[PDB]
Design a protein around this ligand. Structure first.
Ligand SMILES: O=C(CSc1n[nH]c(-c2ccccc2C(=O)O)n1)Nc1nc2ccccc2[nH]1
Ligand SMILES: O=C(CSc1n[nH]c(-c2ccccc2C(=O)O)n1)Nc1nc2ccccc2[nH]1
Ligand SMILES: [Cl-]
Ligand SMILES: [Cl-]
Ligand SMILES: [Cl-]
Ligand SMILES: [Cl-]
Ligand SMILES: [Mg+2]
Ligand SMILES: [Mg+2]
Ligand code: NA
Ligand code: NA
Ligand code: NA
Ligand code: NA
Ligand SMILES: [Zn+2]
Ligand SMILES: [Zn+2]
Ligand SMILES: [Zn+2]
Ligand SMILES: [Zn+2]
Lengths: 231, 231
């Protein structure tokens, strides 16, 4: 039922309704001779939408906004990027040009600038220390500590018990580490345990790439990170 | 013009005619949350066909044979696997059940057995030393030395100037190393130079995965291997 790369040509975006007023958005990107999917989140906040992460690039993100406009028909007023990599901020300029207020932590904004990536305009304060949580409309933003990146955030939708782990959480089908160039392998398991301890009631867990599941995805990611550590 | 993973659902196989009586076969496989393509070769020999490498698995290889039967309509009498990994021998049992004589070097047969992979039935003698070449019907088989694997073979079709590099040769779009668990990074550039020196007249170069090109694919692979070596 969840869309895979098969049903998504490169450049198209699919939406998947997880619960009342909660969708994921799925896009694909081709690099290094393979094709990868990527997830973000959409959360209804009254008569508007909060977007979590771009669709991995300007063209994808323009298709994302067109797909939201036709399938949901509510305005995207704010967006949050969960870390500084292109699958999360690639397309921020498209969002800004459409009138979306783009947000990220100062850590993410700093790292995006150093990398030469697109930089969300607004700063999310209160997330600099591991275990920090802040409310952002219909979601909670949580900094679990360094993992996939030193800045990665996770997002929880309390009304639907949906946990969006971003790239700090792997799908079950991924049994080897992904891009860990910017990761903190030493701290990643501890950061996942902070997620587990803060959101033990989560019923739906969305990885940054691939199929959703339950809280088992946290233990799965810990297994994979530790195996990579011991390579 | 060359098929990519977009036009190939996982489980289907496409044929691409390179020249008179020379085709590549293209399949896809899901692996670790991504989709990868894979190439093999088909070379007409009189009224029969020589197959280079499986389509990466039993289902793909059954689809490969059905696609050959309907699009070319000539019998596959012999097959050669160019190294011992599953994208080259996965499906050998299907070929054997269909009456195809399967071949590999004793080095490949030895390594496949150790790995628990399918084992081609017939042995290709005369390929144990770097630089060894043997004729096999309408092609020449060449052992350039260890590279992607210690056993990898390349195949040249002299009548069409087609060089099938297998997984020792990367497509241009791949700028980072692939699966190098069984590779000899120290010897891979020297092995590529042997290919260059033996087939300087090659006009079309087929990598194990992705888009074909010219002999520049050899220098490209050297560039990528050396960069990975210096990681
Ligand atoms: O490299 C980046 C951001 S780094 C990153 N974060 N997450 C991942 C990632 C990707 C696939 C599967 C798993 C993961 C993961 O482990 O999360 N990669 N973007 C980028 N570079 C490009 C170069 C050329 C063309 C397009 C490009 N798009
Ligand atoms: O390990 C193998 C065969 S080794 C091999 N040879 N060539 C390649 C290859 C594949 C794609 C792109 C480039 C290359 C390359 O670099 O040539 N891979 N298959 C395998 N392992 C798995 C482990 C877990 C789940 C599924 C798995 N499927
Ligand atoms: Cl590839
Ligand atoms: Cl931590
Ligand atoms: Cl992936
Ligand atoms: Cl060598
Ligand atoms: Mg490739
Ligand atoms: Mg994945
Ligand atoms: Na490509
Ligand atoms: Na809102
Ligand atoms: Na023949
Ligand atoms: Na060139
Ligand atoms: Zn990332
Ligand atoms: Zn990612
Ligand atoms: Zn291989
Ligand atoms: Zn391969």
């Amino acid at each position: 039922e969840y869309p895979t790369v098969s049903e998504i040509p490169v450049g198209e975006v699919r939406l998947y309704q997880i619960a009342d007023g909660v969708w994921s958005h799925i896009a694909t990107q081709s690099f290094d001779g393979a094709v990868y999917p990527s997830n973000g989140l959409i959360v209804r906040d009254g008569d508007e939408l909060l977007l979590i992460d771009t669709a991995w690039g300007a063209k994808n993100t323009a298709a994302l906004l067109a797909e939201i406009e036709k399938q949901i028909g509510l305005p995207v007023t704010r967006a949050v990027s969960t870390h500084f990599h292109d699958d999360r901020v690639g397309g921020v300029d498209v969002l800004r040009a459409a009138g979306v207020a783009t947000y990220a932590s100062p850590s993410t904004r700093r790292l995006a600038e150093v990398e030469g990536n697109e930089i969300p305009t607004h700063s999310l304060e209160g997330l600099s220390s591991s275990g920090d949580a802040v409310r952002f409309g219909p979601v909670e933003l949580f900094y679990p500590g360094a993992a996939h990146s030193t800045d990665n955030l996770v997002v929880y939708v309390p009304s639907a018990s949906v946990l969006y782990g971003g790239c700090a959480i792997y799908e079950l089908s991924r049994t080897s580490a992904g891009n860990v160039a910017d990761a903190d392998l030493a701290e990643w398991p501890t950061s996942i345990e902070r997620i587990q301890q803060h959101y033990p009631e989560a019923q739906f867990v969305i990885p940054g790439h691939g199929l959703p599941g339950g809280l088992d995805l946290l233990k799965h990611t810990t297994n994979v990170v530790k195996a990579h550590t011991n390579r």
